[PDB]
Design a protein around this ligand. Structure first.
Ligand SMILES: [Zn+2]
Lengths: 182, 98, 242, 174, 50, 59, 99, 91
């Protein structure tokens, strides 16, 4: 507000308009920038799931360790959370509470994957190509930027065929073929 | 420590057989170790460079694929003059430069 | 180091001071009154654009001036500046005070103070080509005598070799010196005390300055140029000396 | 003609200036003294000017020596011992069961010299009066202060042991 | 031994010109400034810490 | 490697021998080359030069 | 220098394609145009190329002189690190021999 | 300005590398980036590039000390490569 003086300071030791304990460090904004996600409520739509992983992790930690339910049941779950690809490794059972973060689930987003597979140059520019309609998964093109992509389905993202951005790529290698009308 | 000055004397190195002087300069050990380092300083930057050939991912699109062009053999060409401004003189510039 | 060679001038880290980066380097300040060197030092000329005007630069001999080595030994903050008033003490001639006039420029003034008449007579004749120098020929031990002539100076300079050097600055720092404006003492070890050592006088004259509410910032020794001196850049706190 | 990849404008934390934590956003090489030789310190000649700790006074009482008369036995020349203003502020702060040291500290042959500090802590008042001049001769018996001065070149440290005092870095012992 | 004392001190007086800038002579020549050069950013001055 | 062994039978008395060079690389001598009477193939650990002189230690 | 095979150089990703400028053969108009000041300027252009040769090599020998004495100093430095390593073990026996 | 550059550019390039001009001087170690504002001038009581090559003692020094580095930089490279391929081929 004012860079209040030293005697103003001690009466206002606690007031701050920009940063609140309720606001929690602005972690939600801070990862919305790093992954460039469109609408604001998208974070806490993941962070309700990413919290719900840990609540199932916790009560499955409260069962006794030599229980053939419990031993079966999180390894049943780490099969799925690795196939979807939110977590890097399948070995640790305590990745399921420690490595399950929103920024883990927010980088199996489609524009991050187009930046991981070096399709677009940056991560904003990949959102620019999805929204304009140049990218596709198998048959159908995808148009929501915020498409989660399975690690299995991560094989199949390509540029949409006959596009003006898959035509320019093939001109760089001097390998167009207009019988494909690339 | 406890060693004479004669025990640390010298051991000189001998030269090429003078009958075999055509194939000049016999290489000792310390002249081989300059040769096998900087072959392994070539493969280790070539096996890496061949490893990027296996993983090209041919859907990659960087936005500087308009200024670069490629020769018909397949490897790219870059201009001698380098700059964006030394391309080719216009007819009005030649009409002044002549 | 001849009259033929051409030298690059470059602004020093301190304002108003200029370095002459040649084959060897020189310390240089712009001559306010061109065409005349006041004690025969070799002066540099340039030209700046009407045909280009002549701007003459005068070399700043280290061995002549006790201030001069401290620049060339390296001081962090020299409180003399191209706009500020500056009080000078013990300017026998224009050996150094003509230099201090040129570095404060045509805006700020310099108050030359020295007691003796025959060096003071020379200080008059130089002061009528440099408008900044107004010379005062009263004794520096009695500042109430020239109280009418000087008002609110921004940094004093002390080149007195009298052994009561701390009291002769306190009576000039309390009554003339603008608060929070620095004090550049130049201590000579032989002229204060010849019995005790060179370094004791330096530890004695600093502690005498701290009694007079001058927190001294840094201390230089200027040894390769002059034997056994110090210049001690102070700051006149007067209020919050801690 | 609206732009692509639009996103709700929101508050940068790593970059904005209005935040408190983000509000924040010439070398110096001190010359080794013109007195000093490699370690010899060729300037110090008698009489000496010796700084004194709290601890040097306290062990002076237990070992039954005068300050001034007892220092001249160790030192063999004349000396002017001088307690700073920080050190006298410690001797008062030690309190009631050290008051016999506080009487012996204020003696008109024991000089006092002021300092310009914001503090009582004289263990670091003292080294700072030593680096900037190197004419003094520190009298301590603090363990950490000895290690703080034995790294400084050319400063005769002085401690009390057994009967009389001892000096360390004087080359002119006798 | 009186030579090795001489050739030590004469060797350990060259080092003294390299650690600090020791006084030498005066100025007997004509020239004013410095041969080795000026630096702007050195500030070889003991600053009085608080 | 030439002119170390005289006959192709002389090589066969010596195959499997840990040959070394001046440069310090090791190797073995493996088969007697036939069509000239003296020479033999030898596998070193790295590419021998032409300028290099193989020596087989013996007692 | 290393010479990459062209079959390796062809299928490289776009980030790392090595820029190898072909030599020019047909004489450019500019290289038939430009004037070279000869005579007195040649004596003052040979000389600058003769000074900058000296000051590059005087640097790269003295810069090599530091990393020769860097190698010697850290050998002397690690020897002082080893004595402060072993003797620090010996105190923590003679301390805990009391305890 | 960008006029009168050449007699200035040769001069400043002869000051950024002034350690090499005489093997007895050995200035302090500094970098001397070209400053933003400067004014080349002479000493009142022939630019330094023209001044220096008019000397004979320095000009005989650089011709020796340039051939003596270029006797070293040539030494391994390709004249030495062709001679070793020459003696194998010649006999
Ligand atoms: Zn204090």
């Amino acid at each position: 507000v004012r860079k209040l003086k030293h005697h103003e300071q001690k009466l206002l030791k606690k007031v701050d308009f920009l940063e609140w304990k309720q606001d929690q460090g602005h972690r939600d904004t801070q990862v919305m920038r790093t992954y460039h996600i469109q609408n604001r409520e998208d974070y806490h739509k993941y962070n309700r799931i990413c919290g719900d992983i840990r609540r199932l992790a916790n009560k499955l930690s409260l069962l006794p360790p030599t229980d053939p339910f419990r031993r079966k049941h999180e390894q049943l779950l780490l099969d799925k959370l690795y196939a979807m690809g939110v977590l890097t490794t399948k070995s640790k059972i305590s990745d399921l509470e420690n490595k399950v973060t929103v920024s883990a689930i927010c980088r199996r987003r489609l524009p991050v994957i187009m930046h991981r597979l070096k399709m677009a140059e940056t991560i904003q520019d990949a959102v620019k190509f999805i929204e304009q309609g140049h990218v596709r998964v198998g048959p159908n093109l995808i148009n929501d930027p915020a498409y989660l992509v399975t690690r299995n389905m991560e094989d199949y993202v390509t540029w949409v065929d006959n596009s003006k951005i898959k035509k320019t790529l093939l001109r760089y290698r001097n390998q167009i073929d207009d019988f494909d009308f690339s | 420590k406890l060693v004479h000055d004669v025990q640390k004397k010298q051991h000189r190195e001998r030269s090429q057989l003078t009958s075999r002087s055509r194939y000049g300069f016999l290489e000792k050990h310390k002249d081989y170790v300059k040769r096998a380092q900087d072959f392994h300083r070539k493969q280790s930057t070539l096996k890496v460079l061949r490893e990027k050939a296996k993983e090209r991912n041919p859907d990659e699109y960087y936005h500087a694929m308009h200024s670069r062009k490629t020769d018909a053999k397949g490897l790219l060409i870059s201009s001698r003059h380098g700059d964006e401004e030394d391309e080719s003189l216009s007819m009005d510039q030649v009409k002044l430069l002549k | 180091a001849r009259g033929g060679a051409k030298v690059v001038i470059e602004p020093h880290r301190h304002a108003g001071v200029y370095i002459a980066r040649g084959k060897e380097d020189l310390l240089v300040t712009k001559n306010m009154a061109p065409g005349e060197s006041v004690y025969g030092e070799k002066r540099i000329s340039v030209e700046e654009p009407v045909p280009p005007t002549k701007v003459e630069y005068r070399v700043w001999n280290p061995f002549r001036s006790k201030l001069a080595a401290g620049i060339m030994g390296g001081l962090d903050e020299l409180f003399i500046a191209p706009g500020k008033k500056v009080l000078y003490l013990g300017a026998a001639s224009g050996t150094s005070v003509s230099h201090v006039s040129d570095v404060v420029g045509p805006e700020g003034v310099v108050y030359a103070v020295e007691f003796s008449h025959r060096p003071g007579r020379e200080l008059i004749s130089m002061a009528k080509k440099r408008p900044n120098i107004i010379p005062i020929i009263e004794d520096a031990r009695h500042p109430q005598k020239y109280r009418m002539l000087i008002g609110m100076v921004d940094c004093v300079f002390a080149d007195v070799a009298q052994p009561d050097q701390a009291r002769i600055i306190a009576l000039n720092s309390h009554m003339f010196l603008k608060d929070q404006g620095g004090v550049v003492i130049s201590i000579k070890a032989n002229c204060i005390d010849s019995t005790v050592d060179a370094e004791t006088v330096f530890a004695r004259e600093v502690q005498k300055l701290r009694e007079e509410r001058i927190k001294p910032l840094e201390q230089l020794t200027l040894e390769p140029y002059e034997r056994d001196h110090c210049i001690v850049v102070g700051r006149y706190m007067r209020s919050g000396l801690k | 003609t609206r732009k692509f990849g639009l996103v709700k404008r929101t508050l940068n934390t790593k970059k904005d200036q209005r935040l408190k934590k983000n509000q924040e956003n010439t070398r110096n090489i001190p010359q080794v003294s013109s007195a000093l030789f490699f370690q010899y310190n060729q300037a110090i000649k008698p009489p000496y000017q010796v700084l004194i700790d709290t601890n040097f006074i306290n062990f002076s009482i237990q070992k039954k020596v005068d300050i001034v008369r007892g220092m001249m036995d160790c030192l063999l020349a004349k000396c002017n011992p001088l307690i700073t203003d920080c050190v006298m502020a410690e001797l008062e702060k030690l309190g009631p069961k050290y008051r016999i040291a506080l009487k012996l500290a204020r003696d008109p042959r024991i000089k006092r010299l002021s300092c310009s500090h914001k503090g009582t802590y004289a263990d670091d008042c003292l080294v700072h009066r030593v680096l900037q001049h190197k004419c003094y001769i520190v009298a301590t018996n603090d363990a950490g202060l000895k290690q703080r001065i034995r790294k400084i070149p050319g400063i005769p440290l002085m401690s009390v042991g057994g009967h009389a005092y001892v000096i360390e870095k004087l080359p002119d012992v006798f | 031994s009186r030579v090795k004392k001489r050739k030590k001190y004469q060797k350990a007086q060259k080092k003294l010109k390299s650690v600090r800038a020791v006084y030498s002579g005066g100025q007997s020549g004509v020239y004013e400034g410095e041969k080795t050069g000026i630096k702007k950013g050195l500030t070889r001055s003991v600053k009085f810490k608080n | 490697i030439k002119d170390m062994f005289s006959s192709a039978m002389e090589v066969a008395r010596f195959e499997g021998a840990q040959i070394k060079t001046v440069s310090g690389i090791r190797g073995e001598i493996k088969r007697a080359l036939s069509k000239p009477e003296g020479h033999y193939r030898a596998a070193f650990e790295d590419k021998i030069l032409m300028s290099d002189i193989v020596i087989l230690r013996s007692w | 220098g290393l010479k990459v095979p062209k079959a390796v150089q062809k299928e490289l990703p776009f980030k790392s394609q090595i820029h190898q400028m072909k030599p020019q053969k047909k004489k450019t108009y500019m290289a038939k145009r430009a004037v070279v000041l000869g005579g007195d300027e040649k004596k003052a252009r040979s000389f600058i190329q003769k000074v900058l040769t000296i000051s590059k090599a005087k640097d790269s020998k003295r810069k090599e002189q530091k990393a020769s004495q860097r190698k010697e100093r850290l050998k002397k430095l690690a020897k002082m690190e080893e004595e402060k390593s072993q003797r620090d073990k010996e105190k923590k026996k003679e301390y805990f021999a009391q305890n | 300005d960008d006029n009168m550059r050449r007699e200035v550019q040769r001069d400043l390039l002869l000051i950024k590398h002034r350690a090499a001009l005489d093997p007895k001087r050995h200035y302090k170690k500094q970098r001397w980036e070209v400053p933003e504002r400067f004014a080349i001038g002479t000493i009142i009581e022939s630019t330094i590039l023209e001044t220096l090559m008019g000397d004979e003692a320095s000009n005989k020094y650089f011709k020796r000390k340039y051939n003596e580095i270029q006797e070293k930089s040539t030494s391994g490279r390709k004249a030495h490569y062709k001679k070793m391929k020459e003696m194998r081929k010649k006999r």
